[PDB]
Each structure stands twice: as C-alpha cells, then as structure tokens.
Amino acid sequence: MKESVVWTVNLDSKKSRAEGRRIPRRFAVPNVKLHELVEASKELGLKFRAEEKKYPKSWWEEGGRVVVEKRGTKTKLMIELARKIAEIREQKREQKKDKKKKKK
C-alpha cells in the first residue's frame, strides 16, 4: 500500500538533470530500458509499474514513465530501484548475442 513516481530518464545517466534526471550516477543505469525497469518488478510480481501515454502509442523510444511502491522515499527509492534495475542491465552484460541463444 505505497506509491512512488519513477521516470525512464530519472534512472538514466545519459540524460542531463534538465533532461529529466535526478539520481546519483553512482547507482544510475544509462539508457533506461524497459527490460531493467519491468524485469525487476517481475522478480517480486508487485513493486514497480510502467505505463506509456496513448499519444505516442505503438512502440517508440520517445521515453516512458514508471510508478513504484514505497511512498515517503525520494532518491533513496531511486537508489533501490537502481539496485534491482542495475542487476538486469548487469545481466545483459554477462550474456551477449554470441552466448544469448546459439554458441559460436
């Protein structure tokens, strides 16, 4: 029973503070990917949420937005969001197209 707003650029180091970033680079993942934001919540099945506006509709990289449970927390929530999200990006680094499906 807690709600906190999270952004795609908020946990992105590639974007500047004006661009929409407000998280410490020490725990910020560049190129906010749905896989890191959504896959982290999938681990608990309930904690984060991501919804894109109908305006852009379809699938586009124009930017998205996510909402996570917590409420009362600020960057600390973002630090924790990066804690789970950083794993997913970190998981992508461990595996690559060569070792993703068929080995060569």
Which CATH number goes with the domain that contains 31? 3.30.56.30
The residues that bridge with 66 in the sheet, in sequence order, are 6, 50
Q: Please list, in sequence order, all residues whose beta carbon lies within 8 angstroms of the beta carbon of residue 58, skipping any fewer than 6 positions away.
A: none
Give CA separation, 43 vs 35, 38, 48, 71, in Å: 12, 9, 10, 20
d(CA 61, CA 3): 25
Query: For residues 30 and 86, is the Cβ–Cβ distance under 8 A?
Result: no
Experimental method: NMR
Domain that holds residue 22: 1-104
User: What span, in angstroms and rounded, lies between the C-alpha atoms of 45 and 59?
Assistant: 23
User: Structurally, how many domains does the chain consist of?
Assistant: 1
| Bridging pattern class, strands 48-50 and 65-68 | antiparallel
| Residues whose CB falls within 8 Å of the CB of residue 16, separated by 6 or more in sequence, listed in order | none
